[model samples]
Target: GASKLRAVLEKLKLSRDDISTAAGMVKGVVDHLLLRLKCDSAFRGVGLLNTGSYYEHVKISAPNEFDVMFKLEVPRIQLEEYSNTRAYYFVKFKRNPKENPLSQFLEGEILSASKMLSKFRKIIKEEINDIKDTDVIMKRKRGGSPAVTLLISEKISVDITLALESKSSWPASTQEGLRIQNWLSAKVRKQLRLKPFYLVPKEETWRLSFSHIEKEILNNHGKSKTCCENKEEKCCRKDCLKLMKYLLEQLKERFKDKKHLDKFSSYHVKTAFFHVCTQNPQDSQWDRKDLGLCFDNCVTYFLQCLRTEKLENYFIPEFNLFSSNLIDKRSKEFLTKQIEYERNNEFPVFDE
Candidate 1:
């Protein structure tokens, strides 16, 4: 069982040279685009954060698509009372700094998100025309996404999402994470929250994101300080995440046109992997040779999430990713059966 699984992981592992070059090329493209974008007066404050699978080191196939988060940090703002979603909130400035360029999008005392995003969307559209060396095409807008997709010369897909960072403590919410006592120290966790919380724009509310903390955790995941620093203490934790991500990617393609697959995204798989990481916090549990066990553990955790129809977003603990409207009863049932079949049959879906 482990032998074949090893072969699959070997195939999935990206060569250092390939991934290194990809990082350089991807960064260069984004840099030039940002240079052009900031040429506009409204976007000078914006900065880019390289995010998503490619940056996280779980990218399976050739790296063509890059997810870049463009952020503008806003200080001295308070999160007002609202719904319990925690992920969504109404932001109010502590004092009126109306002269700030962001004030143009404000309605009364509340900062308006939709109008800002609309202008953001429009500005990004115009910047593409100024780009000469690259034939950039801005993809059609989708209501569910905050990205303004840029297909660079029809090869690289760079998605830019505008997120606002609030220099404040952690929100009243975010954690599958009690098992982290052995994984990471409490000081590190507290230290992380101070790095600040960020919110992306949605119609009337602010949607939160913790990608910055996530990258820090994944990069520093270890039971002992020296774990993964040397080959002797290397771990297969990231390998397991890549395998899980690739499994879902392959399965989605294997069953294209299925609405159930449409509802789920890589974030769901990524969320489950984090929980499994917490459940088995010790570094020894994910030794390089134990890829099969770690991968199996991820599958089991994900299936449990599906069966119970409740996969909580790791950051916003209150939001149920598998909520009725999002996944639906039928979709979860279908995915439960399909994943179970693959699990029982030793995942032939991953073989081809």
Candidate 2:
């Protein structure tokens, strides 16, 4: 059983060359944006953060994608509450400005995300054209997508988002969240809180993203200082997450009518992993030798979440991940049964 699981895990590991090539392409894009941010008045003073699973070291298969954010840090922007989602806010500029740099993109004090994104898309397209040797091309923007996607070498896709960062305190909804204090310790939690958070472009409301903290947690996952170090006892925490992510990707492809499953994504699997770690905080529970059982337990926890339709956001308890609008009872039941079959059948999806 261990041998079989190891085989699947090995297949998920990305090669060194793959990592290097991906980094080269993504860095070129980042470098180009940095140059613009420094020299161009429209993009001056914007902060850049490279995020997503690729940077998180949990990216399986080839590295053909990346997520980068060009953040406009607003110190005095006003926020208008938009919806009950708690994450949505229509950003505004305070104290009326006659010559504000961003004033052209404002709609009655409300910052127009779509307008700002359009300008970013135009700038990127114009800049990339100057690099005649590179075969990178900007793709047509999809409605409602925050990223201005660029395809490198006609294969890898890079998503570049124009975001607004608020230095204000985190919303009250997230105050009681990030329940990893017991697992990762209070010191780690405090350090993470000291870091800044961000809000990205969305429909009317700015969506909250805690990529920095998530990356920190994944990097230093152990309750002890040397959990995954060579001399210390190795844990299967990351392995379990990779297995579940691969399983979820396979299941999504196998299922028909993908609209119902679109809401159930890799983020859900990552969220479940965090909750599982919090519930079973002991390192012994995730020993390498018990990889099979640990992976099964993670799947079981996710299934329970799907069945009850109540997977809460790890950082925001107010947000129900499996809200009724996102998924229905039938879809939940179908996923639960499929996951049960995969677990009992040794995940035949892995072979395919």
Candidate 3:
């Protein structure tokens, strides 16, 4: 059993050389973006932030995709709650004159996501012309997606997103959230709050991004400051996350015929992992030798959430990740049965 688990983990581990090559390519594209933004008239305040699982060191499989956010600095703005779920907001500019570069993208005081994205796509298309010698390919815009997809090569694709960073107080829903004080200490959480929050274009409302904080928590996830720093006593917390992500991807592939499962994503798995970490705060539970057991524990907690259909957003507890009736009762039962079967059977998908 241990041999099989080790094999699965080894298969999931990316080669360092591959990671370096991908990182170099991603950086090149980001540098190009910076150059373009520097010369552009409208997007002067925009800056680039390399984010997502790849940068966070939790990405599984080949380094095929990367997420970079173009953060627009808009310190003064009004955010109207667009959803009680606390994920979406309508951002309106305040006190900015008509000459303000972003003013053209506003329609009746509401920031126009479609319009902004359209312009953003045009900008990216224009910028790609300068990098055509690098063998990069630009992908057509997908409907409802805020990212401008750029194919750097056959194996690597980059998704550059337009976002706004704000230093304003977080929404009311997030007031009691990020309960990591107990796990990482109150001082750390307070410092995180001081950092700016981000909002990305999503349909009509801007979706808040806790990605920066998520990365911080994952990197520094230890009861003690020197938990994972010592080579002799490092734990398997990150290893467990890699396996869980692999399991979900394999499960999705196994059940590709079921359309309802399409709604289930890595975000759900990631959220469940966050809750599981908080539930089992001590590093003892994720000891290096207990990798398999820790992984099983994470999977079981995720199964329980699916069974109950109540996976809340870690940042905005008000948001039901598994809500909107996307996963019907039948689908929930099916997923529960599938996961249980896999748990009892040592995950045959990994064996394949």
Candidate 4:
């Protein structure tokens, strides 16, 4: 979200390849977690805040210096109600005579929908109560001021429906693949009935690196392909080029394969990779969703290398298979919830 990030890139006219690396650097943090949540959780609430845009901050005195300070701000919401008090004690401790474990337990739902999103929503709702909901705005009164409100809403929740469909399968059958796609497509249509939506299916590839995706796009634009030149635009269009850049970087880092840089230039490596992953349509069965883990491992490691500024794994890729498995298992659990709600929410899909 750095305005200068884009400015510098355009200033130099860097190739998509180079810009993409930077773009990956910028958006990687958000996408890393988002992609994980998408692959693992039944659904996740995504929050976007433009850092280049103006922002506000505030300070609050704590009982102890080490006590973590968390702030919540919203333009509108009634602040009187306990639920509306952005920092209400939703998790209260029962009175106990004994010294009540000096080391705080750090209790409550540390990891759950309520803590992650619902809490943010509740805080924003409280702020809304303080203003006229019609046209509200956010701004900081002063540095570390209590009235410093974020120009962002916290109450609005974007629910990604966790239907039983939309999962990728092994070696897709022309019949089964089409059926699965149709099932997922229908659900998407229903979810976005009132608003325009895009169905971004999970895709897999072996030969196509994230770097390649960007480089190709850059070539398409007739720009110089190098990391130093492409600044913000490289990072901005990362989703479209994530796999490409990531693959390129990972190979160079892990295998010292700079030769690949040129190989991707001539051929459509990504399309080829997609073909390889889904090629066995007739008789071969491929688990499409499962492949996400393998891909995520490669990407997350590249990101870790970028952020931590170190090579944690010298040989095998630092793929987070555990995390991916955790997500897959969690998604299945969410699907169970859908099954429970099917009676009321589901439409009868006559098996053909």
Root-mean-square deviation (CA) per prediction: 2.8, 2.6, 2.5, 23.8
Please identify model 3 stretches exceeding 4 Å from their true place.
1-3, 14-20, 51-59, 96-98, 141-143
Task: Report how far residue 308 has shifted in candidate 2, in Å.
Answer: 0.6
lDDT of 2 by residue, 1-352 (tens): 6678788877666352443576666676668767876676656777666543334233354357666667777767777667676767888777555646677777786888888877877777788887765778877756545478778885677777777777777767789888888899887777777777788876666777786676678778987778899745899998898888888878887885665566577888999999999999888888999998898889889998998898988889878878888688878888889889988887899888
What candidate 1 gets wrong by more than 4 Å, as runs, is 15-29, 39-41, 50-59, 175-179
Q: What is the per-residue lDDT of model 3 for residues 191-237, given as tens digits with 9 covering 90 to 100? A: 88887888887657888887678668778898878889997669888
Better of 1 and 2 by lDDT: 2
Off by over 4 Å in 4: 1-50, 53-113, 133-352
Model 4, TM vs. native: 0.19
After superposing all C-alphas onto the true structure, candidate 3 shows an RMSD in angstroms of 2.5
Worst 10 residues of 1 by lDDT: 50-59
Assess candidate 2 and give its lDDT.
0.76
Q: How far in Å is the alpha carbon of 4 misplaced in model 1? A: 2.5
Candidate 2 segments whose C-alpha is farther than 4 A from its true place: 14-20, 50-59, 95-100, 141-143, 256-258
- For residues 38-75, write the lDDT of model 1, one tens digit per residue: 77565667777554333433335536666778878787
CA lDDT of every candidate: 0.74, 0.76, 0.77, 0.26
Q: List the residue pairs that clash in candidate 1.
A: none
TM-score of each: 0.90, 0.90, 0.91, 0.19
Error of 1 at 104 (Å): 1.1
Against the true structure, candidate 2 reaches a TM-score of 0.90
| Each candidate structure's count of clashing pairs | 0, 0, 0, 33
